[PDB]
């Protein structure tokens, strides 16, 4: 078959067919970093405000992990 | 009415654009009106100044 | 579904599409009332300073 989806109803038809990109590659990498840190110890607006709390938390988790391993190294430089 | 109505909805999309475009062009006319009626307000202010000059 | 149900769905939809454009059209020319005073006021003022 051949569909013709207009631009007004495009995300809704695509999410309907699902039930019947460098941005979300980067955010996939950031969710992978959040999955590595824990192991180490929808509308368009509803995605757009939750990608904000993915990025805003990935930034603080990365800086707090990089201010922790580089401090563990400084600890071992005194224990040696 | 399935295969009549789709043609009708198709026509509304072109008409929708057209109402908007006609208002966007109305706007453009308003801008020219501003330059025209202002061109007239300056030479009527010239003679206002020439009126109180020939009085002095 | 049925020809009545699609007809109903039809009157609501072409109504929303059309009404929305007409309401947006109002917003464009509401903004044109603002630009008419603003350009007219700038243009007149610049010249009337020189006239004075």
């Amino acid at each position: 078959v051949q569909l013709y989806i207009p631009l007004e109803v495009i995300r809704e038809v695509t999410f309907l067919l699902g039930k019947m990109l460098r941005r979300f590659d980067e955010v996939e990498r950031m969710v992978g970093f959040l999955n590595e840190v824990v192991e180490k110890h929808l509308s368009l607006e509803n995605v757009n405000d939750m990608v904000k709390e993915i990025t805003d938390c990935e930034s603080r988790a990365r800086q707090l992990d990089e201010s922790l391993d580089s401090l563990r190294s400084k600890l071992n430089d005194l224990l040696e | 009415s399935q295969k009549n109505g789709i043609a009708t909805l198709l026509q509304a999309e072109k008409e929708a654009h057209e109402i908007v475009s006609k208002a966007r062009k109305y706007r453009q006319d308003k801008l020219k009106q501003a330059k025209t009626d202002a061109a007239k307000e300056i030479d009527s202010y010239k003679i206002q100044k020439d009126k109180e000059l020939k009085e002095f | 579904l049925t020809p009545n149900q699609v007809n109903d769905e039809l009157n609501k939809m072409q109504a929303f599409i059309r009404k929305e454009a007409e309401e947006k059209a109002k917003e464009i020319q509401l903004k044109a009332d603002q630009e008419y005073e603003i350009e007219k006021t700038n243009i007149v003022r610049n010249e009337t300073n020189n006239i004075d």
């Binding site: 989806i5 109803v9 | - | 699609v6 769905e9 939809m13 072409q14």
Partner: peptide, 20 residues
């Protein structure tokens, strides 16, 4: 029957075309 009901229930009067 699912594409026809869904594009009409949300408004947005620009219908899709489903050919075979």
């Amino acid at each position: 029957d699912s594409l026809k009901d869904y594009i009409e229930t949300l408004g947005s009067e620009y219908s899709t075309v489903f050919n075979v």
